[PDB]
Design a protein around this ligand. Sequence first.
Ligand SMILES: O=C(O)CNC(=O)c1nc(Cl)c2ccccc2c1O
Ligand SMILES: [Mn+2]
Lengths: 13, 209
Amino acid sequence: XVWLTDTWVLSRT
Amino acid sequence: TKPLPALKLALEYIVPCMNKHGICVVDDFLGKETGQQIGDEVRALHDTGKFTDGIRGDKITWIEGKEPGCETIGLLMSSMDDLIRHCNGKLGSYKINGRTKAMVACYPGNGTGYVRHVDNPNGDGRCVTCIYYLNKDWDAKVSGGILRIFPEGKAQFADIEPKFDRLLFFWSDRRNPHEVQPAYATRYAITVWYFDADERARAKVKYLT
Ligand SMILES: O=C(O)CNC(=O)c1nc(Cl)c2ccccc2c1O
Ligand SMILES: [Mn+2]
């Protein structure tokens, strides 16, 4: 549930 | 796990991610069962000779989404559409009102790729590129096939592995030149392009065939 805002990847689950 | 709802995914990740970086990756977009189903449909199209050749060694076929045997591809497309709708005109300044059909693309290993290019460099109305990757257990270390993006204004490039069940957005214009590095296994992707209404109506490109 965590977005590292300097990156552009996030897992939906 | 419990997947993040589409509306939350769009408003609290995709919108801010696109506006900050112009690139956005959502992993595990639809889950394993649906992903593998999409793969079965695409492999069926490939095995039944629907692909035709499309600087690049790609083979492509266009899918409207309603054809018999492409139900899960249609579900993928409607899911992309739901995400774009949820973005509620917060993707930059774009008024998104249409899209292409789905381009199913195959790089059949053997080092095939796509040289560095810009999806829409002539103002043809496409503002967002949306790509879904369906390659089960794909490992760039073994099979290559990375999508390298060279975002304008940034020194470092962005390497996107074509991972199973992976959804990718990026600005289609000159901000994001990109290349498909050589693929050493069969590499499938499904791309949809979304149109900004006004840019598209400008009709900078006339198609005669
Ligand atoms: O597949 C990827 O990861 C990125 N693919 C592309 O950037 C790409 N772009 C264009 Cl404009 C075309 C255009 C025609 C056929 C394949 C394409 C393609 O794979
Ligand atoms: Mn491209």
